[PDB]
Amino acid sequence: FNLDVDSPAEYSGPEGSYFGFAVDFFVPSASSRMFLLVGAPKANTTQPGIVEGGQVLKCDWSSTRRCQPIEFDATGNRDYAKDDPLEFKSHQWFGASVRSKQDKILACAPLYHWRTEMKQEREPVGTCFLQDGTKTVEYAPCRSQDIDADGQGFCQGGFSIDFTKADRVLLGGPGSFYWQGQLISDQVAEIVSKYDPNVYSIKYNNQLATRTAQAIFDDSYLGYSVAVGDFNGDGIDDFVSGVPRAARTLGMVYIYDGKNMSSLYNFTGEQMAAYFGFSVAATDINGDDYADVFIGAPLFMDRGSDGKLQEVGQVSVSLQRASGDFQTTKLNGFEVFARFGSAIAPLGDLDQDGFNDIAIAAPYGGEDKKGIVYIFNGRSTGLNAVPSQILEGQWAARSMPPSFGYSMKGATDIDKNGYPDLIVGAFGVDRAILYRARPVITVNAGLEVYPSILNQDNKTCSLPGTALKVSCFNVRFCLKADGKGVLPRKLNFQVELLLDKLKQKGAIRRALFLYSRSPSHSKNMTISRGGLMQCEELIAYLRDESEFRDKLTPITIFMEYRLDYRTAADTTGLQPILNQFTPANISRQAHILLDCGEDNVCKPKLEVSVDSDQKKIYIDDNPLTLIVKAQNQGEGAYEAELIVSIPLQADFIGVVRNNEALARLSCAFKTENQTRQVVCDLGNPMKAGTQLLAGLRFSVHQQSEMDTSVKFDLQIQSSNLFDKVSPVVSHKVDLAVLAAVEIRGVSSPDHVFLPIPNWEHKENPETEEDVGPVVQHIYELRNNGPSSFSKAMLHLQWPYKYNNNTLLYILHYDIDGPMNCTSDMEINPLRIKISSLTEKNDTVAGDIHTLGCGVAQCLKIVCQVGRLDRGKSAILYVKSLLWTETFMNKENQNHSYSLKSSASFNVIEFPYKNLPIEDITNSTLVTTNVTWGIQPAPCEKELQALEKENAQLEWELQALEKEL
Amino acid sequence: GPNICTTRGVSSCQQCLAVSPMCAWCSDEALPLPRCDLKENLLKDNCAPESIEFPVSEARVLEDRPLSDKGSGDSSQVTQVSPQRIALRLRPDDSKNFSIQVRQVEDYPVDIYYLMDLSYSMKDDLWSIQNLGTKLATQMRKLTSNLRIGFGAFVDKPVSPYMYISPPEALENPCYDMKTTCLPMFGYKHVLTLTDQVTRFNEEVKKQSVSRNRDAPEGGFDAIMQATVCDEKIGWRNDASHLLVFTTDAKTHIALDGRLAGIVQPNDGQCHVGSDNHYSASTTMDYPSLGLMTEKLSQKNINLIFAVTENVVNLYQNYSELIPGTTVGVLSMDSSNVLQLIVDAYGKIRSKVELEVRDLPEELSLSFNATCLNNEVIPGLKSCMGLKIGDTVSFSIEAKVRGCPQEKEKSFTIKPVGFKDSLIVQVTFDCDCACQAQAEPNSHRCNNGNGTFECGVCRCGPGWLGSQCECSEEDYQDECSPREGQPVCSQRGECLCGQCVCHSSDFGKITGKYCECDDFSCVRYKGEMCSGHGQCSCGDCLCDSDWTGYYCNCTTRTDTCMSSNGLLCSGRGKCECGSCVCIQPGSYGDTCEKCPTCPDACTFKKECVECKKFDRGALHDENTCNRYCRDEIESVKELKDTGKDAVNCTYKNEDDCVVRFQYYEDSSGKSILYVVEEPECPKGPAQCKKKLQALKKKNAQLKWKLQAL
Numbered sequence A: 001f002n003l004d005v006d007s008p009a010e011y012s013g014p015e016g017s018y019f020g021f022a023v024d025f026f027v028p029s030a031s032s033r034m035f036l037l038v039g040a041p042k043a044n045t046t047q048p049g050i051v052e053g054g055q056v057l058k059c060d061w062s063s064t065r066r067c068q069p070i071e072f073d074a075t076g077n078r079d080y081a082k083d084d085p086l087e088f089k090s091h092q093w094f095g096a097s098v099r100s101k102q103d104k105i106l107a108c109a110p111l112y113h114w115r116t117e118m119k120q121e122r123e124p125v126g127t128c129f130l131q132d133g134t135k136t137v138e139y140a141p142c143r144s145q146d147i148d149a150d151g152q153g154f155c156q157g158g159f160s161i162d163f164t165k166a167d168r169v170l171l172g173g174p175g176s177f178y179w180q181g182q183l184i185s186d187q188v189a190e191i192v193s194k195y196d197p198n199v200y201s202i203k204y205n206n207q208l209a210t211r212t213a214q215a216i217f218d219d220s221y222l223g224y225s226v227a228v229g230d231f232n233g234d235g236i237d238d239f240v241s242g243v244p245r246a247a248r249t250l251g252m253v254y255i256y257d258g259k260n261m262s263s264l265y266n267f268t269g270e271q272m273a274a275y276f277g278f279s280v281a282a283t284d285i286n287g288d289d290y291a292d293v294f295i296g297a298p299l300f301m302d303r304g305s306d307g308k309l310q311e312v313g314q315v316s317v318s319l320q321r322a323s324g325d326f327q328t329t330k331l332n333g334f335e336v337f338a339r340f341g342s343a344i345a346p347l348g349d350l351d352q353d354g355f356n357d358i359a360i361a362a363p364y365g366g367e368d369k370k371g372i373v374y375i376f377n378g379r380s381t382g383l384n385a386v387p388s389q390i391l392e393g394q395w396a397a398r399s400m401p402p403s404f405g406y407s408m409k410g411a412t413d414i415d416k417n418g419y420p421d422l423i424v425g426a427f428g429v430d431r432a433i434l435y436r437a438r439p440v441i442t443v444n445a446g447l448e449v450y451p452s453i454l455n456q457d458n459k460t461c462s463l464p465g466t467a468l469k470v471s472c473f474n475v476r477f478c479l480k481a482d483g484k485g486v487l488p489r490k491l492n493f494q495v496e497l498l499l500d501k502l503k504q505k506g507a508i509r510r511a512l513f514l515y516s517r518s519p520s521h522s523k524n525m526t527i528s529r530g531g532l533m534q535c536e537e538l539i540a541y542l543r544d545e546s547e548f549r550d551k552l553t554p555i556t557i558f559m560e561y562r563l564d565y566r567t568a569a570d571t572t573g574l575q576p577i578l579n580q581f582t583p584a585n586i587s588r589q590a591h592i593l594l595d596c597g598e599d600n601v602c603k604p605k606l607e608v609s610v611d612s613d614q615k616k617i618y619i620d621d622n623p624l625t626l627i628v629k630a631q632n633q634g635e636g637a638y639e640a641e642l643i644v645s646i647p648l649q650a651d652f653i654g655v656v657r658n659n660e661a662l663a664r665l666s667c668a669f670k671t672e673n674q675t676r677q678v679v680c681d682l683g684n685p686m687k688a689g690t691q692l693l694a695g696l697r698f699s700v701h702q703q704s705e706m707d708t709s710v711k712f713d714l715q716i717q718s719s720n721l722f723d724k725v726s727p728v729v730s731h732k733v734d735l736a737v738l739a740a741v742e743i744r745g746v747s748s749p750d751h752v753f754l755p756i757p758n759w760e761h762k763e764n765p766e767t768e769e770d771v772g773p774v775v776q777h778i779y780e781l782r783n784n785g786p787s788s789f790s791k792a793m794l795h796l797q798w799p800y801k802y803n804n805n806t807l808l809y810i811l812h813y814d815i816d817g818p819m820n821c822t823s824d825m826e827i828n829p830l831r832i833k834i835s836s837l838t839e840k841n842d843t844v845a846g847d848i849h850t851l852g853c854g855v856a857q858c859l860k861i862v863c864q865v866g867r868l869d870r871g872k873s874a875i876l877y878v879k880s881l882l883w884t885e886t887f888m889n890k891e892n893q894n895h896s897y898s899l900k901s902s903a904s905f906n907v908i909e910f911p912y913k914n915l916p917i918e919d920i921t922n923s924t925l926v927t928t929n930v931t932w933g934i935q936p937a938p939c940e941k942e943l944q945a946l947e948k949e950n951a952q953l954e955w956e957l958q959a960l961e962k963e964l
Numbered sequence B: 001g002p003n004i005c006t007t008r009g010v011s012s013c014q015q016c017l018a019v020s021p022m023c024a025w026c027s028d029e030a031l032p033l034p035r036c037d038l039k040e041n042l043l044k045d046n047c048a049p050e051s052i053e054f055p056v057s058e059a060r061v062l063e064d065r066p067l068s069d070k071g072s073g074d075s076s077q078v079t080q081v082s083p084q085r086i087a088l089r090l091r092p093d094d095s096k097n098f099s100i101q102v103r104q105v106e107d108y109p110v111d112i113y114y115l116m117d118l119s120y121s122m123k124d125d126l127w128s129i130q131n132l133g134t135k136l137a138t139q140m141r142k143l144t145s146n147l148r149i150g151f152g153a154f155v156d157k158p159v160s161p162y163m164y165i166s167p168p169e170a171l172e173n174p175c176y177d178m179k180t181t182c183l184p185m186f187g188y189k190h191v192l193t194l195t196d197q198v199t200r201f202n203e204e205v206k207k208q209s210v211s212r213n214r215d216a217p218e219g220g221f222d223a224i225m226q227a228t229v230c231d232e233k234i235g236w237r238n239d240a241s242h243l244l245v246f247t248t249d250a251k252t253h254i255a256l257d258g259r260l261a262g263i264v265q266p267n268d269g270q271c272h273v274g275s276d277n278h279y280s281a282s283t284t285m286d287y288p289s290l291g292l293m294t295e296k297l298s299q300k301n302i303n304l305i306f307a308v309t310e311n312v313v314n315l316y317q318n319y320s321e322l323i324p325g326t327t328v329g330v331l332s333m334d335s336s337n338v339l340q341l342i343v344d345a346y347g348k349i350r351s352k353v354e355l356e357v358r359d360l361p362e363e364l365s366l367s368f369n370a371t372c373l374n375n376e377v378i379p380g381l382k383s384c385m386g387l388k389i390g391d392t393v394s395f396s397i398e399a400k401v402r403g404c405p406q407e408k409e410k411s412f413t414i415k416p417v418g419f420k421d422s423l424i425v426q427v428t429f430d431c432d433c434a435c436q437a438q439a440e441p442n443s444h445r446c447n448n449g450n451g452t453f454e455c456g457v458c459r460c461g462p463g464w465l466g467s468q469c470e471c472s473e474e475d476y477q478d479e480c481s482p483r484e485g486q487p488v489c490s491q492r493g494e495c496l497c498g499q500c501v502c503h504s505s506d507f508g509k510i511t512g513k514y515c516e517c518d519d520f521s522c523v524r525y526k527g528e529m530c531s532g533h534g535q536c537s538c539g540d541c542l543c544d545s546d547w548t549g550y551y552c553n554c555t556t557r558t559d560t561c562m563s564s565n566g567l568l569c570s571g572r573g574k575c576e577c578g579s580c581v582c583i584q585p586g587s588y589g590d591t592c593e594k595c596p597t598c599p600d601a602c603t604f605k606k607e608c609v610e611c612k613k614f615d616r617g618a619l620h621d622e623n624t625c626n627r628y629c630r631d632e633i634e635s636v637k638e639l640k641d642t643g644k645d646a647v648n649c650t651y652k653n654e655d656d657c658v659v660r661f662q663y664y665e666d667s668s669g670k671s672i673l674y675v676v677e678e679p680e681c682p683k684g685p686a687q688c689k690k691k692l693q694a695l696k697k698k699n700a701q702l703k704w705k706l707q708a709l
């Protein structure tokens, strides 16, 4: 917000040269002359027989704006042989990437070609030119005896570059290894010391490089963008590179160790083709000294309010937690096709607030699609969502869009003003702009009025110039200022005070100063940085009762303060700016007491009470209502307002205007300093004998894992001198534990029909087909309630056998969840191999005798459940095989049974230790009905009848026996 | 009773009308003590009827054409949407409901432009489609009697690194080293314009050849964009089905891939194909952004189809999901099954109708209740699935405007994706009273020109607190309170000249007759007032576009409730405020997609078999069988082992007969039901005394043994 858009410096280059496609600062250090560096890849050079060879210009910032091209290579294309060019520098796009550190500068030509030095060919290996002080050498690692696509032949090294605090170079090239991409790092020392002009392919003793991977990673474009930052213990800067086409063009960002080039972390885009990893940057925004990551996805499409997809681009902000677990948030663009997130530029600490800031660009954003750059300030919590400033492009599209902001570099104080500056560039219009930061001035103002309440009959102080005594008082206003950087220590201010501001021209002004005889005070006050605040006070009085009839309206004392930006300049005339968020003015108010009668002294006498709801708050966000009764027992109370201190667990959802009995009150939420408050207007003033009753709602979510209750502190406040406040009421609300845990079950299939198609008994069963069909019983334990439980137990009763008959043969059992189980019997004793199906689709949308584990031989499976929170569960899949011969043998012929499998659970512990834990348990059974078909109807008749009755009567008896 | 129009709109007419659509204003005569009140209430106050400023939101149908049964008629205009034009009038913060009907007519003419990847890997594919034109043409006789076709071709941006730059014989013949030969490289080229003559097509197929290129990913998007935006060269017909088919065996390049080749100019969505029939900006301009492609496809109403080989099917599956009105199919390596893919894909497109909106003002929002079959109504939804030809669908729309914008007139379009016909809504706004134009600045009617007189009321300037701009700190009372047993102006002001003067807090603006309103009274959801999706007025959150609820924390959106299968909450829940509310027991998740304990697939599909095949069951009774069971189902002689994935199912129907079938999930991504054609059903057709007695003995015992309990 402090950047000066008033009169920025503008630099230009040859039209069609893409001047301003790449930018960076040049700081030789040793407190030395400053320059700007601008790359122009399509700039026609003087190099013999080379068109648009590209060049990087050094723009003089001081005074005149003139760019002087820095020539790394004046020669043309070297020769492999007579009439056989070795290289091709035409359209090599030199200056497409430029980076500078100290007295070192590196520019590259990603489109530089190569003859392979073996056969006649044109391979874009790319090249670069390093210049350190008096030495200038060519650096081209991808140019080697490893050629063609499979090699580094098409690497295009130098596409993106950057330095490290260890003076090591990080250069990436997408084309290496069938466009898998590659990251190459070299010590600057070696780059120059190992340089031989007679040698085209150079080897470096110490070089870090990514190796060829599987063909599946082809066309990933690793090295599309690069940035540096340390993400592990060592102080070594680690490599960060965007990989836009990685993961089926979903986009990724690879991070390699600065030491052994070993992969540390990875990132992946949410949307395909969004080009997640187009650009990358690293800075510590929250001032935790841990480098925070930023990834651009210009083509990302968020969903508008209508639910329609719209391309606004997106930038993911990942904070580096010491633990190593990145807490990441996303940031969508503000316009369509603006391609927000094309450029991410560290600004360092721009406002010197103690938190590094940053800038994001949408080169095609803004009306006329010129370009826009958004600035974002960092803080404790992290990077502030909304931008604090916006930059606009001043040039239009001839043919190519201006592309303003497509490339930018900040975080450097060029004017020595103490604040960093920003270089932005538009290659579309072949221009470049510098933005100088203005000094930020934080300011604190104050206003006091005593006595606030005024007895019209006081008449203490005497009105000068006459024998009249008037009711007077004191007014005290203060101004403290401070700031950092280059600026005059003394700062003048034009302060104006008006009494009874509410009454404007046309209406009488009820109050004026004791001397000036006017409700206006003009003062030229100059203060210095620090706690040298002045704070002057004056005496003002009130007109006679017989000069007006209005004693009701509160007299508002208004103060306004504005500095002179002209006399606050620093160097070339750069005008400062106040802190982004500072009150332009502040005002207090006085009042006139009356009807107090004899004593002429009003005693508010305010009381406040809160009725206990009796309703325990359960651990989600639970609705909570609080009854409040505030009564004014004594005389009037001015500026009466109910103030309430809520804990961290509480969020104020709003006031209750639903109930008629409850008076509708206006209330707002106020958070000052570290205090968390709720302010409600009780009337100004709150007349005598006034009793109100209302209610407030809150949505509360537990903060501390274990808490007995949540305390609230309530009181009433007034601007009066005496009894200006009421007692403080502490009302605690006990937290309860509510966990609605249910257990569900099912049988797949739930109904089996006999006989089994093409089934045959096996004296020695082997496969599933030899035994019978697959019967899966599935139980799920889910915790619905707001509260969570830490541990629980689950018991299963399985219909193991009936009269030494296998019934259901459990083959295996699987689990998804924290639960761990044990069977009291060996699962699948016969060691039958598993075949049939864990995956995919649940999204698709003889009478009867039950064989319970109580009436049949039982197999038990006990399970220990872990922690289950809201909407979380644990599942047990029991896969079994129906033992066919069991139902084909003995009493089993025409009878139908229901195989019952019971399962119960019980919660043993809870994560909340300071609360009265309540045990909870329920149970459920799963039945699988086995039925015979095709036998309902066609001496012998009466015979068959009694045969069925008999058989049925046998089973019912067998049941009662085993049930007792 | 004491409506808000009395309290909040007493200031002036324009304000009164803004208070609520139910508020009216009397702009004539004079009757001291509510100039802003309900229409009927003002009549009881004897306010001249013709002096009542009371706008009314209305939506008139400007053009109502009947739908067509067939689209092959050249004797009349084809209508697929009704109505075509609607004039919409709206009040501040008001809403109105209107409807729109859509139908896919029979025998509707079609445009099919063929676009093929000519990479060397697709060499064989060219020879296989030499007779495709006519062979398909005969197959299209049944679908329509009107059809035009053409052809186009693409390779990739003819530039390094994508193209072989050296040796010189390479750029002329990339297959110089390869056996035989091959054409040079080119971005995209137009061959045959959409024409009714199928003959000339096949002749061109032979005429065209194949080309090789390094780096498998191709530049198809350039061809897609151009073919879409270029109407003349391709020859897309109005009132015709626009079908663009895209065949490739490899990946595809995406926007920003051009920067490697030194291309920094975004796609402009403009046609750069000339009389040479080649993409001019192929080398100069970068690959199109998907958003741009979506936009143009939508505008030109082109249905894009992805015919892609198995390996890339998944890649284009995800891509297609980002672009509405697009399908994905598996193109065989030999490009033999393409013909089938065409007919099938067409069926998928005409099985669904989706609506889109263009040029919708930011202040205006829309709601929907989709009616697909019979009494089926689906709130929030703007499309329908599983349809046929000649089928008609309806949509109940409700437009809700936030405030009353400045501009007088706006025009936004609502249309089916891919269809030419549409509904153009002309919207206007009444923010002002007719008496406002008749205002009298500083008229003598208000204290000798010390106040302005409009809409039958004097709006006084600063300094005068009384009506007619008379009294300033004089001796007067009136009513500054609703009743004598209530405070003055809610202690937010006092009675001066018989009127309440509201204070001004640092929090916001106190307004209203009795100073009972403000900007900060409104409820706050989480950390923000009205969830930040609404602006507060007198303690009332007014939700912005596409936002609803008391706290404005409930969106009108639906897409978040859609499942992978294309159903709302997987059909096991209802969408509320963007999130699915699961109904089916044991079901949960974002789209209620997770249901471990709900019945097995066999239990769900037994109803589908019972309906589709047996025309009965609980499913058939509700006539939802057709939309529910989208699984291809056929009667098989015997149930066979199709896969480890396949599941053999068995159940007893209403006829007490055993029915067997199976369910297949996979095999390229289509579900099928195979039902055994012959369900098993019931079969129609001395010593014995000792046997009966033997059982009688048992019965006597068994009965007597019944005890205990």
Ligand SMILES: *[C@@H]1O[C@H](CO)[C@@H](O[C@@H]2O[C@H](CO)[C@@H](O[C@@H]3O[C@H](CO[C@H]4O[C@H](CO)[C@@H](O)[C@H](O[C@H]5O[C@H](CO)[C@@H](O)[C@H](O)[C@@H]5O[C@H]5O[C@H](CO)[C@@H](O)[C@H](O)[C@@H]5O)[C@@H]4O)[C@@H](O)[C@H](O[C@H]4O[C@H](CO)[C@@H](O)[C@H](O[C@H]5O[C@H](CO)[C@@H](O)[C@H](O)[C@@H]5O)[C@@H]4O)[C@@H]3O)[C@H](O)[C@H]2NC(C)=O)[C@H](O)[C@H]1NC(C)=O
Residues within 6 Å of the ligand: A212, A213, A214, A215, A216, A217, A254, A263, A264, A265, A266
């Ligand atoms: C951030 O994201 C990054 C990107 O996603 C992640 O990086 C990834 O990290 C993983 C894990 O290390 C890597 O997987 C590794 O791949 C190695 C491949 O090495 C290539 O080159 C060598 C020659 O130098 C070949 O030998 C390799 O084999 C090829 O051919 C063989 C058959 O002969 C085949 O088996 C391979 O799949 C491969 O074939 C492919 O590639 C060829 C071309 O080379 C194609 O023609 C072909 O079509 C295929 O596409 C390969 O070419 C591999 O060597 C590593 O092996 C480890 O794991 C395997 C698992 O099976 C194991 O067998 C192997 O050996 C073990 O057993 C041996 C005995 O048999 C023991 O001797 C040995 O000690 C081991 O116990 C190793 O264990 C490994 O799989 C990814 O390559 C890498 N991706 C990229 C792009 O960088 C990164 O992990 C992530 N970071 C974080 C923090 O999440």
Ligand SMILES: *[C@@H]1O[C@H](CO)[C@@H](O[C@@H]2O[C@H](CO)[C@@H](O[C@@H]3O[C@H](CO[C@H]4O[C@H](CO)[C@@H](O)[C@H](O[C@H]5O[C@H](CO)[C@@H](O)[C@H](O)[C@@H]5O)[C@@H]4O)[C@@H](O)[C@H](O[C@H]4O[C@H](CO)[C@@H](O)[C@H](O)[C@@H]4O)[C@@H]3O)[C@H](O)[C@H]2NC(C)=O)[C@H](O)[C@H]1NC(C)=O
Residues within 6 Å of the ligand: A840, A841, A843, A844, A845, B320, B321, B324, B325, B326, B327, B328, B347, B348, B349, B350, B351, B352, B385, B386, B387, B564, B565, B566, B628, B629, B630, B631, B632, B670, B671, B672
């Ligand atoms: C788990 O299991 C469930 C249930 O089986 C799966 O749910 C299925 O999801 C798929 C998508 O993944 C759905 O396919 C849709 O098909 C419709 C086509 O409309 C219907 O009616 C048509 C009338 O002409 C008919 O032709 C169609 O028949 C096809 O599909 C059936 C299978 O259902 C197949 O048997 C036939 O051979 C045909 O192939 C069909 O009945 C389509 O409109 C949907 O969208 C398509 O079109 C849009 C618009 O152009 C496009 O944007 C989409 O990309 C797509 O091309 C969609 O394709 C299917 O309906 C669901 N099946 C059922 C019966 O509910 C689920 O996928 C599984 N989950 C997982 C993750 O594994």
Ligand SMILES: *[C@@H]1O[C@H](CO)[C@@H](O[C@@H]2O[C@H](CO)[C@@H](O[C@@H]3O[C@H](CO)[C@@H](O)[C@H](O[C@H]4O[C@H](CO)[C@@H](O)[C@H](O)[C@@H]4O)[C@@H]3O)[C@H](O)[C@H]2NC(C)=O)[C@H](O)[C@H]1NC(C)=O
Residues within 6 Å of the ligand: A448, A450, A451, A455, A458, A459, A460, A461, A471, A472, A473, A474, A539
């Ligand atoms: C009738 O009106 C007269 C004239 O105003 C009034 O006399 C005033 O009395 C007040 C209160 O006693 C005096 O204010 C004091 O000023 C001293 C410095 O001179 C302050 O230190 C005192 O308080 C300190 O702490 C306070 C805590 O709140 C602060 O508010 C204050 O800033 C100081 O830090 C105290 O405020 C004042 O001096 C006179 N005014 C004059 C000009 O004589 C008298 O009180 C009124 N009589 C009745 C019956 O009300």
Ligand SMILES: *[C@@H]1O[C@H](CO)[C@@H](O[C@@H]2O[C@H](CO)[C@@H](O[C@@H]3O[C@H](CO[C@H]4O[C@H](CO)[C@@H](O)[C@H](O)[C@@H]4O)[C@@H](O)[C@H](O)[C@@H]3O)[C@H](O)[C@H]2NC(C)=O)[C@H](O)[C@H]1NC(C)=O
Residues within 6 Å of the ligand: A014, A015, A016, A017, A042, A043, A044, A051, A052
């Ligand atoms: C660097 O120096 C190079 C020296 O050759 C420059 O090359 C020139 O670049 C142009 C394209 O920008 C080449 O293209 C020509 O374009 C014209 C078409 O232009 C028409 O209109 C112009 C007037 O605007 C008119 O002068 C022309 O006659 C045309 O009517 C074609 O007609 C030409 O045949 C040709 O294709 C030029 O060939 C080329 N000029 C030279 C000297 O050969 C290059 O532009 C410079 N690059 C930068 C960025 O500075």
Ligand SMILES: *[C@@H]1O[C@H](CO)[C@@H](O[C@@H]2O[C@H](CO)[C@@H](O[C@@H]3O[C@H](CO[C@H]4O[C@H](CO)[C@@H](O)[C@H](O)[C@@H]4O)[C@@H](O)[C@H](O)[C@@H]3O)[C@H](O)[C@H]2NC(C)=O)[C@H](O)[C@H]1NC(C)=O
Residues within 6 Å of the ligand: A757, A758, B639, B640, B641, B642, B643, B644, B645, B646, B647, B648
């Ligand atoms: C759904 O039910 C279908 C019908 O029952 C199942 O079809 C079965 O599929 C399996 C393979 O998945 C086949 O299993 C094979 O069986 C043959 C038997 O033939 C042998 O013996 C016969 C005489 O009985 C003789 O004529 C032959 O020459 C052989 O000597 C075995 O030889 C194989 O090794 C293998 O086990 C079944 O044959 C087949 N049954 C039928 C009737 O089609 C299907 O599996 C079920 N679907 C799923 C996936 O659940």
Ligand SMILES: *[C@@H]1O[C@H](CO)[C@@H](O[C@@H]2O[C@H](CO)[C@@H](O)[C@H](O)[C@H]2NC(C)=O)[C@H](O)[C@H]1NC(C)=O
Residues within 6 Å of the ligand: A248, B314, B315, B317, B318
């Ligand atoms: C889009 O691509 C994704 C992979 O990036 C596909 O997801 C896979 O789908 C197959 C089935 O076709 C599963 O077996 C894999 O487990 C999935 N992989 C991952 C990582 O999710 C997906 O199929 C493609 N399109 C869609 C959405 O169907």
Ligand SMILES: *[C@@H]1O[C@H](CO)[C@@H](O)[C@H](O)[C@H]1NC(C)=O
Residues within 6 Å of the ligand: A492, A522, A523, A524
């Ligand atoms: C106060 O002093 C400044 C110079 O410091 C002068 O310009 C200004 O006019 C003075 N203000 C007034 C109106 O007293």
Ligand SMILES: [Ca+2]
Residues within 6 Å of the ligand: A229, A230, A231, A232, A233, A234, A235, A236, A237, A238, A257, A258, A259
């Ligand atoms: Ca490191």
Ligand SMILES: [Ca+2]
Residues within 6 Å of the ligand: A283, A284, A285, A286, A287, A288, A289, A290, A291, A292, A319, A320
């Ligand atoms: Ca950090």
Ligand SMILES: [Ca+2]
Residues within 6 Å of the ligand: A348, A349, A350, A351, A352, A353, A354, A355, A356, A357, A377, A378
């Ligand atoms: Ca900062």
Ligand SMILES: [Ca+2]
Residues within 6 Å of the ligand: A412, A413, A414, A415, A416, A417, A418, A419, A420, A421, A436, A437
């Ligand atoms: Ca600076």
Ligand SMILES: [Ca+2]
Residues within 6 Å of the ligand: A596, A597, A599, A600, A601, A602, A603, A635
């Ligand atoms: Ca008193």
Ligand SMILES: [Ca+2]
Residues within 6 Å of the ligand: B155, B156, B162, B213, B214, B215, B216, B217, B218, B219
């Ligand atoms: Ca290619």
Ligand SMILES: [Cl-]
Residues within 6 Å of the ligand: A100, A101, A102
């Ligand atoms: Cl630097």
Ligand SMILES: [Cl-]
Residues within 6 Å of the ligand: none
């Ligand atoms: Cl997310």
Ligand SMILES: [Cl-]
Residues within 6 Å of the ligand: A303
């Ligand atoms: Cl979203």
